[PDB]
Enzyme design. Structure first.
Site, PDB file in Angstrom:
ATOM      1  N   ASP A  81      41.498 -19.654  47.817  1.00  0.00           N
ATOM      2  CA  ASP A  81      42.690 -19.558  48.684  1.00  0.00           C
ATOM      3  C   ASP A  81      43.174 -18.119  48.800  1.00  0.00           C
ATOM      4  O   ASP A  81      43.742 -17.730  49.819  1.00  0.00           O
ATOM      5  CB  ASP A  81      43.892 -20.372  48.159  1.00  0.00           C
ATOM      6  N   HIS A 123      54.473 -20.294  48.288  1.00  0.00           N
ATOM      7  CA  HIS A 123      53.797 -20.883  47.125  1.00  0.00           C
ATOM      8  C   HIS A 123      53.625 -19.932  45.959  1.00  0.00           C
ATOM      9  O   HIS A 123      53.376 -20.370  44.848  1.00  0.00           O
ATOM     10  CB  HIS A 123      52.415 -21.433  47.483  1.00  0.00           C
ATOM     11  N   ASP A 247      52.556 -25.873  60.647  1.00  0.00           N
ATOM     12  CA  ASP A 247      51.521 -26.873  60.338  1.00  0.00           C
ATOM     13  C   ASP A 247      51.974 -28.341  60.443  1.00  0.00           C
ATOM     14  O   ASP A 247      51.192 -29.255  60.191  1.00  0.00           O
ATOM     15  CB  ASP A 247      50.855 -26.613  58.973  1.00  0.00           C
TER      16      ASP A 247
HETATM   17  C1  LIG Z   1      38.749 -26.106  56.291  1.00  0.00           C
HETATM   18  N1  LIG Z   1      39.117 -25.137  55.268  1.00  0.00           N
HETATM   19  C2  LIG Z   1      38.315 -23.927  55.155  1.00  0.00           C
HETATM   20  C3  LIG Z   1      40.242 -25.378  54.454  1.00  0.00           C
HETATM   21  C4  LIG Z   1      41.008 -26.538  54.650  1.00  0.00           C
HETATM   22  C5  LIG Z   1      42.133 -26.782  53.848  1.00  0.00           C
HETATM   23  C6  LIG Z   1      42.518 -25.870  52.853  1.00  0.00           C
HETATM   24  C7  LIG Z   1      43.733 -26.158  52.002  1.00  0.00           C
HETATM   25  O1  LIG Z   1      44.514 -27.027  52.370  1.00  0.00           O
HETATM   26  N2  LIG Z   1      43.917 -25.483  50.866  1.00  0.00           N
HETATM   27  C8  LIG Z   1      45.012 -25.712  49.935  1.00  0.00           C
HETATM   28  C9  LIG Z   1      46.196 -24.760  50.129  1.00  0.00           C
HETATM   29  C10 LIG Z   1      47.130 -25.273  51.230  1.00  0.00           C
HETATM   30  C11 LIG Z   1      48.337 -24.354  51.428  1.00  0.00           C
HETATM   31  C12 LIG Z   1      48.353 -23.668  52.784  1.00  0.00           C
HETATM   32  C13 LIG Z   1      49.515 -22.684  52.886  1.00  0.00           C
HETATM   33  C14 LIG Z   1      50.666 -23.350  53.619  1.00  0.00           C
HETATM   34  O2  LIG Z   1      50.549 -23.766  54.760  1.00  0.00           O
HETATM   35  N3  LIG Z   1      51.810 -23.464  52.962  1.00  0.00           N
HETATM   36  O3  LIG Z   1      52.725 -24.153  53.418  1.00  0.00           O
HETATM   37  C15 LIG Z   1      41.759 -24.717  52.655  1.00  0.00           C
HETATM   38  C16 LIG Z   1      40.630 -24.474  53.455  1.00  0.00           C
HETATM   39 ZN   LIG Z   2      52.017 -25.144  54.994  1.00  0.00          ZN
END
Ligand SMILES: CN(C)c1ccc(C(=O)NCCCCCCC(=O)NO)cc1
Ligand SMILES: [Zn+2]
Ligand code: NA
Ligand code: NA
EC number: 3.5.1.98
Length: 357
Positions: A81, A123, A247
């Site tokens: 991440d 986060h 999102d």
């Molecule tokens: C298709 N691809 C490459 C991915 C799909 C999902 C994630 C993910 O959700 N990761 C966990 C972290 C989610 C937090 C996102 C930050 C956010 O929107 N915070 O609110 C990662 C990669």
């Molecule tokens: Zn988010």
């Protein structure tokens, strides 16, 4: 008295370099610029957050580590991440500085509203990058606002629980955090049940609204207004920090909530009507065009303008095809929010709010 727009090409360039969301800051800015909304705001070039400024929240071992990596990393939350890529320290210093600059405009009475669409990285922990967040800029913003404003309300409307911000302030009564988010085991970050209310002297000053897939404009606003109205009256905030991660929006590949920017804009109009120093942050948003559409539109409501439906020609016009319109449909999928459970969530919150303050 015109809203502050944190923006510079260096800054948008720096933020375009986030591996997870390339070119997103440009698209957001580009759409805003295309609608000429920046002509209606006071463009403020962001400060770069100095070491000591990020040290207000992040521990020094972490900050110093980011610096070298930028030139046990699984311990400092870096990895998938959060990659250790050339310039990530300058990345964090720019985002944090931007939110700090926004708050500094607020406490100086430069503006009623200050906007950092590139912020919202809610986060990050004191010693630990997390969920795409190298640095918790919302926390540093709240901490800056605290120099003048006695009570701060953080409202987080991102799809994901604003855990890092909640954690930072969970022990104090001077900052109340309110999060609306998906709560489903396995879905990041997995924290923030309705029963999570804060701790010690901060007890009841953390509010969490766990929502399920499919929520639409009408019901999300009903819930948000119900929680906020009670929060405002009980907490009496002096300033507001507001995370509007996109999102939740129809067409996000995370495909969880089913909001349009109009329903989020209602929640924003409701906060803006309190007429308080307000720091506007971005956050998640993984359909890049829709995210641009959303925050451009929210920038519209901040200014109290209604925008043309047709997307103006600009750098990224083709991403808006085939319809080239501002508005969002609604995917047709069920609203998994049984209204029985929403009422249990709402009651439990109102009960907690009676202890404030
Ligand atoms: C298709 N691809 C490459 C991915 C799909 C999902 C994630 C993910 O959700 N990761 C966990 C972290 C989610 C937090 C996102 C930050 C956010 O929107 N915070 O609110 C990662 C990669
Ligand atoms: Zn988010
Ligand atoms: Na949230
Ligand atoms: Na708190």
């Amino acid at each position: 008295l015109v809203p502050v727009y944190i923006y510079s090409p260096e800054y948008v360039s720096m933020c375009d370099s986030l591996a997870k969301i390339p070119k997103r800051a440009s698209m957001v800015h580009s759409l805003i610029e295309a609608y000429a909304l920046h002509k209606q705001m006071r463009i403020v070039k962001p400060k770069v957050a100095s070491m000591e400024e990020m040290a207000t929240f992040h521990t020094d071992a972490y900050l110093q580590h980011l610096q070298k990596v930028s030139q046990d990393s699984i311990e400092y939350g870096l990895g998938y991440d959060c990659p250790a890529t050339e310039g990530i320290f300058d990345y964090a210093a720019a985002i944090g500085g931007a939110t700090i600059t926004a708050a500094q405009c607020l406490i100086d009475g430069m503006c009623k509203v200050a906007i950092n669409w590139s912020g919202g990285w809610h986060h990050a922990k004191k010693d630990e990058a997390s969920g795409f967040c190298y640095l918790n800029d919302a926390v540093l913003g709240i901490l800056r606002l605290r120099r003048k404003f006695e009570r701060i309300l953080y409202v987080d409307l991102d799809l994901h629980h604003g855990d890092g911000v909640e954690d930072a302030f969970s022990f104090t009564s001077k900052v109340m955090t309110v999060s609306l988010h998906k709560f489903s085991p396995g879905f990041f970050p997995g924290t923030g049940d309705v029963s999570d209310v804060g701790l010690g002297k901060g007890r009841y000053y953390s509010v969490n609204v766990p929502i399920q897939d499919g929520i639409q404009d009408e019901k999300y606003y009903q819930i948000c207004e119900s929680v906020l109205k009670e929060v405002y009256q009980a907490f009496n905030p002096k300033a507001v920090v507001l995370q509007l991660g996109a999102d939740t929006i129809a067409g996000d590949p995370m495909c969880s909530f089913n909001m349009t920017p109009v329903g989020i804009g209602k929640c924003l109009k409701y906060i803006l009507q309190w007429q308080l120093a307000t720091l506007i942050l971005g956050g998640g948003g993984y359909n890049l065009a829709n995210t641009a559409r959303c925050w451009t539109y929210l920038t519209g409501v901040i200014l109290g303008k209604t925008l043309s439906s047709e997307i103006p020609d600009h750098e990224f016009f083709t991403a808006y095809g085939p319809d080239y319109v501002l508005e969002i449909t609604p995917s047709c999928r069920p609203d998994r929010n049984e209204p029985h459970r929403i009422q249990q969530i709402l009651n439990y919150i109102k009960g907690n709010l009676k202890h404030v303050v």
